[PDB]
Amino acid sequence: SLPAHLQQTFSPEEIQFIVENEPIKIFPRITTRQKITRWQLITTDDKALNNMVAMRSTEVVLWIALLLKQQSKCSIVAPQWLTTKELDRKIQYEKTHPDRFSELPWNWLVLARILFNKAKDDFHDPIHELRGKIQDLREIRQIKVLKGLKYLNESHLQLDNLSLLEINELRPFITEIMDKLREIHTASL
Amino acid sequence: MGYYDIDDVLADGTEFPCKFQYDIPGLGYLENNPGRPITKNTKLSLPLWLARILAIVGPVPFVELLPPDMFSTKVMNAIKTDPVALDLHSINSHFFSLAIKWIMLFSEKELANVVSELLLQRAQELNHHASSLSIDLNIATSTFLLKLEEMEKEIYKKSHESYKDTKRWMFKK
Amino acid sequence: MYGDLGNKLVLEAKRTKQLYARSNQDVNLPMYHEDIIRNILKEVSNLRKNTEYLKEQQQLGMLDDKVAKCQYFVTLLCMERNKRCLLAYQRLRTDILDSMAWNNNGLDLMSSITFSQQDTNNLSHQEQEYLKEYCDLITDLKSGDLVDIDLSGSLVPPSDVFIDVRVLKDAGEIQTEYGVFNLIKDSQFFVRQSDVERLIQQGYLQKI
Amino acid sequence: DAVFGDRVRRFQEFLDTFTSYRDSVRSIQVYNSNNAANYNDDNILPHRIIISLDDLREFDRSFWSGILVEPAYFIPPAEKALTDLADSMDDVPHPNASAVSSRHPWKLSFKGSFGAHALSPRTLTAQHLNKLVSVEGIVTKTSLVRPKLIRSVHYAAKTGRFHYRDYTDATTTLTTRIPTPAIYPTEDTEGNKLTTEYGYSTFIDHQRITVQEMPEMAPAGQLPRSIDVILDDDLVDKTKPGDRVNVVGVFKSLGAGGMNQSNSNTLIGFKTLILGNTVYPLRQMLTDFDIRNINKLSKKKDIFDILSQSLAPSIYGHDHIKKAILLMLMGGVEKNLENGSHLRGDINILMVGDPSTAKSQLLRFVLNTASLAIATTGRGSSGVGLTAAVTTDRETGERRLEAGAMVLADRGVVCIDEFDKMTDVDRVAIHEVMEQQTVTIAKAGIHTTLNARCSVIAAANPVFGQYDVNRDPHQNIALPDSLLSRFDLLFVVTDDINEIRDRSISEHVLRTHRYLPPGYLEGEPVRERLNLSLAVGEDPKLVTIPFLRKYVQYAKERVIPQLTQEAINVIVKNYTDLRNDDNTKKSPITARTLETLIRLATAHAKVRLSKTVNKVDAKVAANLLRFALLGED
Amino acid sequence: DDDNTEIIKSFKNFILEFRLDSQFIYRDQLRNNILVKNYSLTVNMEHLIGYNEDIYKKLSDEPSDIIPLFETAITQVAKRISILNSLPTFQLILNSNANQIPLRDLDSEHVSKIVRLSGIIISTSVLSSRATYLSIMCRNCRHTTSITINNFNVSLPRSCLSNCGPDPYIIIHESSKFIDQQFLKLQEIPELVPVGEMPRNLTMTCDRYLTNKVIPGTRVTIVGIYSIYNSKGSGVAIRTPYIKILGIQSDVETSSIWNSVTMFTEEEEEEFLQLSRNPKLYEILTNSIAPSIFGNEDIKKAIVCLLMGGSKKILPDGMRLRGDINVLLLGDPGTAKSQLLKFVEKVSPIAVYTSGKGSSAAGLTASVQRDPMTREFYLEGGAMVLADGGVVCIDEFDKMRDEDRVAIHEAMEQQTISIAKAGITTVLNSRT
């Protein structure tokens, strides 16, 4: 809260927490179907976890999936946007329109890093190609952010599709610059 | 209007030129002349926490505020010609706070149009230098950070720290 | 003129703030400034004497009112400036003290075992008293309605169930809920993160 | 083509937007016109204006950016428009005999703020070529003024018509063109003989100066660097060696740069030059407020004491020497006498004393406070370096003379330190300058007499480490008698141990060492670097130094007192009393003491801003010389 | 052209695909350099060897021909990772860890090969201009033309492109681009000179971002190419060797002008402030002065005080006060007086050691020399000019001649040197 800044900005670890508080799909390697000890969770619905059958698709929260993959009882399926084809489509869309941001999920960087670190085996494409494509996208997004920073004023800004980490790393500069501009304008009234 | 702000307290203690409009005895320690009483039409440099109030109470007030040296036509022309290269630290270490103060006391639309542009054009260079995280395997940064106002150093430090934490978390293995 | 000394005090505060701002780990407050503060006290006392003297000299009716108003305003303004400087310095030092008091898991700080971050003699006596009642306030907060939640716990989110830790200082056997840890120096543990948060916070363990 | 005409139209609009330039054009035009109509004359203003870059910045940002960044494509269009406006203003006809051939086109000069274009001869690199820049420095060398041909006119027989040929050079114009061989045409197109008609052709004066960096701003362990500037037309002979100048012009490349028929070499690069547009000297003009203050402060009775004490407020004591320095600043009146003689009006002072007696810290103060001052050290100087040196002019090819320290300080002061440590061969030359005030050069076919009218203040040490009172004065000073006779005032200063003096002087020194410049925090090192921001806009009571400079200038240039009889009566009685006494003075008294009294009286009369020498001036001169010779104080 | 394209492609793939752990270091360095307007790139040779040995072998045998291809690969990658164009051709700076070759071991066997060597800078020349983009026009047909030049050693065409003369072409100086060239002189390390031989000197050329980086007296390490240029010495078919600098490592952090700015990363600043807080720092600093000398504690404390130095003040009236300390040691033989002078030389960032017997006033303050070519007079620095902002250690001070010793009086206190010789009248700074 108070120590180490934290007054008005989130740390990267808290952003990671928020990201891991989101659902994901898995392929269980165990069967916990009730016969013809139970999970009984208090913050997430446990219906899927209680009723599990092997070699079938279910969805749970992300951190439970990581805890299961720590053991040998899970296999997380990466989202469909984590593919070379779908990344090359977004790169082209990014190139063609130099005044809007492409539509990527608000956790693409954090999810990509977490999945590359933990579930390296589950990817179908080679991981180095995807890692290069992520950097290729990030550089162009940085160029567009740098160009858009010139239009700062006292009224309001619109950043339609900027990601969570990109917003977090830029908030202290943007807010303070516009605050100072607003004070300068208000003083002259 | 921050009572406990340290930087506001420091910036509020700067000396501004002013002229006495009355003739009054008993003063003189303002001039460092204890026994000598002050005369009429005398030009002295008084601190801002005193000159601001002495120019309000009288009607004609006791003291008239004179145009400052830091808001001359030369400084405005230098600001307009090249904002980035200008050394605001040499002009005054608290340029912006005194600028908004001067705009508040005397409504000046011209100064509000120049200070805003100066800040907007210097923000780009501030961001460029703050985003440059070194990689282990320049003279520009050292030269530029010696021309920064007291207020701009805080923004530079905040932006730099945020960028370093983001980079650290991204590449933690 | 009169307030020119107090500015120096404010300057000192700025330096302390930098040590607070550029602090990878917790730091200690520098020495108190009782001599400068006493100098402002002396000069504000002299200003009070001057205001009194102006009061009598006006109320015998030897001087014009418009003349006396100016020095009255000057003395009032100088006293206000000195008060502002002293209060700003005091509030900054108070904020740092509150931060340290919160960052030691409550406790009585200097009376009991401390993390050796601060020497006793740096703080003023009134500051030492203030710290004691603030610690008591933290203590009777922690026993409020929020007993289950540890209001003085760690503020970094939990994201690793099992961690590797290394012992820094030697100790004896310590019982924990459902088990025992034997703190032989230069030994490594692989255990759940929740059990060793307390011991890492107190410097008996390393890494995470 | 189209861009040229568009830019001409833009500048034409700029000219009638601001009416000041149009009024200055008319003022110059009417002055030149009505000057030529004065047949009974009692001289000619050049065709050049100074425009502010600032106003152009509000008017048209694009044109201002073009001038600052790409001068070679925006200055020539502006000059044509200015010439057109000037031609339009001149309604009166001028059917002159030969002015029809030479138009003398109007040119431009700039002022205002240059932003990042204000540099020095060291921070100027290949990134600034073909840009408008301003450089600050000190002039070291200048070339001789030569005429250069710009257009030639020839007359053809059997036809009676004239034909003209134009010439251009790399330094003449801002745009590269096909070169010209500078050979006069001899044959007409039809083969008729052509005769050159001087008096209708056009020639322009050409000069080249060298500007060096200020040595005080050089980095550690490095020597100052210099650059070359070319001046033409009306800018010639506006600078002299030793001057501090600021030159605004275009930084330009020239030549072939070894990329040609010559052999390939890594040691060959291009040559760089500056085509100066304007020169500004870095004489303080006085307003009526300043003059009124000077006249009001003149009437105060104790003005001499205040003026003398205001000198060097960081030196404790030495009141009489500080009075003597002030009297040096306001020199005496020089008398030109028959037989081609002149009585010198300069006051020369020598200081002999013990080590660490603040002798060298007064010479440094005189260097700064005076209008013209040249510093010299005994062991690091030569005779050829003080009078003149024979050198060569590379640009034209002749052999010429280069000024030395003494002749560069004409109507100035020379401060010599460690004067006794100078070699004998060196010390003879200074003798002549102290006696005739002229230098004679008879070397290498250059027979010339050079004027050197300078005041000498010098500091030396006795033969031993410290002054001895048990030995005769001549034994203490190693200088010869002939040299010693040429100094008006010799001050022997001694450090004597006394507890009260030590307590006062130590307190003063400790107070001085605790000074903090405004805008600096405690413990903050002084940043004597300016961060490359050379300039922001390119063009008991004590008195402040600039006011003293104004006072000295006004006194030197506005009052010339004359001697009176009642002052002579005091001077003669003082001289007769001093001559006939048994007191042992540190220097002999001779018939040249009377001239010293006269000069000191004249100087004190100038201090009072009066046109006559009074009795009080004689009394002050007598007291000063009695203190100097006797120490009776 | 069918091999240069593949070479450029290989270099671009090296720049874009090299990764260690989880970060593209060479891709990030380019973007960070572009932001602060640094148009250059530094590459470590070990990474290049690890990536692909064929690429390293291509560079190691044909440097002058291959290096420009890497130069254009860098600026092709930059325009892709920076722009969706006022970007000049970038610069390549190389780092090597190979064995160092002495200057006197360089011979005809090492021509056109990249070498690594160390020496002492003795002189630095002034900056000169070299053309990169030349705009050209013909004297008769008058049409525009352009030429592009790289500084890795060209002339205007000896013909006409579309009668015109033999080689008719002139340079349009406006709209032409130039860069910065500097010449430096090297010398051997004093301890590596062979027996009975005087030290030898060598010539080096630096460009663009490697100019104004060293000062005379500095000990440096140089990575460059050993080449020859025909010029001008009655020998037949002989050439003069020189070195084109590619990388410079300098011990002193100071640049040419000594910006008086911090060149310390936070990781070193934290160490320095931690050191400053030691309660017994004075004893630690004293014990570090000549640990092989017994006793003499007060002299070592005085040496520490001299090394740190005092403060300097400027006053409103123009007065200047000295802030440096001078020390004299007058003592008996065998008391380690001369073993402290040579230690102070080593420890000080800038220091000169001289002997009073072999000295002169011109050599100590400044000299005046005549240029053989220009035939004018110029000033050359001396012992007190080189040792500016540092320390000069004068041994055998009692044996100095009385004429030479008196020349130091002004420099000791007024910290200036006045020269009034041969039409040159200047005052030079000297704070030592």
Ligand SMILES: Nc1ncnc2c1ncn2[C@@H]1O[C@H](COP(=O)(O)OP(=O)(O)OP(=O)(O)O)[C@@H](O)[C@H]1O
């Ligand atoms: N009266 C004084 N007031 C202030 N400072 C003084 C005075 N006398 C000497 N000093 C100080 O002594 C120091 C040396 O003085 P300075 O260099 O002028 O002496 P000097 O007469 O030229 O000596 P030297 O005979 O060694 O050439 C300076 O720091 C100067 O400030």
Ligand SMILES: Nc1ncnc2c1ncn2[C@@H]1O[C@H](COP(=O)(O)OP(=O)(O)OP(=O)(O)O)[C@@H](O)[C@H]1O
């Ligand atoms: N206190 C000491 N500790 C260690 N070695 C010493 C000491 N005193 C002298 N020496 C040794 O004595 C030798 C000669 O000393 P050095 O050359 O410094 O003499 P010096 O004082 O310069 O003499 P000189 O007055 O004759 O020039 C060296 O080998 C040095 O190491």
Ligand SMILES: [Mg+2]
């Ligand atoms: Mg001296």
Ligand SMILES: [Mg+2]
């Ligand atoms: Mg010895």
Ligand SMILES: [Zn+2]
């Ligand atoms: Zn042709």
